[PDB]
Design brief:
Elements lengths: L5 H6 L7 H16 L2 E2 L19 E5 L24 H13 L12 H4 L3 E5 L4 E2 L11 H15 L4 E5 L1 H6 L9 E5 L16 H11 L11
The structure holds chloride ion.
The site of chloride ion (CL) has 3 residues, from loops.
PDB class: hydrolase
Keywords: hydrolase, uracil-DNA glycosylase, cold-adaptation, base excision repair, structure-function relationship
Assembly: monomeric
Length: 223
């Protein structure tokens, strides 16, 4: 309750009283009493604590949280120090190394530095049962995160959405292309990264779009 950013809590307030949200909360509570669920309860909404909703400049969508011990901490693609960057993040860093001048691999996979600058690192599904990918899909989270994307689409303007993978492309269909910028590419996973992600240069393009909208670019190196 206290681990949920105030501006976000206010703008997303309508969701908390909806039937799907109540059922989702009931489900997750049940799961946490019977199994180990990631990320910890107090980090499920970390993405709402790094910056205000009005200051979001870029949005990156993920699927569900990493399901390994000590990995997930509320930000998509990010892992808690000193956990090593998972395969997808390795490719994200690889693209950054060639796309952003002066970018250097930070040696860890904690993306908090980006979130603090206004990069929303949103997983479509916010919890996962330990060791079981997609174990919490189709339980209500997708609707809640759709609400987040919709709020930004309707209430903000000039936000850059980086959609990686078919799943993110579909989820991003709700985004108003007339009010925001949408960049798409295949997923950074080693299974698909070589078919378009590597070379997509979304990070420099994103900053180009921000400058255009009279907004300060993201310092992708600040990790
Ligand atoms: Cl738990």
């Amino acid at each position: 309750m206290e681990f949920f950013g105030e501006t976000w809590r206010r703008e997303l307030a309508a969701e908390f009283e909806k039937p799907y949200f109540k059922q989702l909360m009931s489900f997750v509570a049940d799961e946490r009493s019977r199994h180990t669920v990631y990320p910890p309860a107090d980090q499920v909404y970390s993405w709402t604590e790094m910056c205000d909703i009005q200051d979001v400049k870029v949005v990156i969508l993920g699927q569900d949280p990493y399901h390994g011990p000590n990995q997930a901490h509320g930000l998509c693609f990010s892992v808690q120090k000193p956990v090593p960057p998972p395969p997808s993040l390795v490719n994200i860093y690889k693209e950054l190394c060639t796309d952003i001048d002066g970018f250097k691999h930070p040696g860890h996979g904690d993306l908090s530095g980006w979130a603090k600058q206004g990069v929303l690192l949103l997983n479509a599904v916010l919890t996962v049962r330990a060791h079981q990918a997609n174990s919490h899909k189709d339980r209500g989270w997708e609707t809640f995160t759709d609400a987040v994307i919709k709020w930004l689409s309707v209430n903000r303007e000039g936000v850059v959405f980086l959609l990686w993978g078919s799943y993110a492309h579909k989820k991003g269909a709700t985004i108003d292309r007339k009010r925001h910028h949408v960049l798409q590419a295949v997923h950074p996973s080693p299974l698909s990264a070589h078919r378009g992600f590597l070379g997509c240069k979304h990070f420099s393009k994103a900053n180009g779009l921000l400058k255009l909208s009279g907004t300060e670019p993201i310092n992708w190196r600040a990790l």
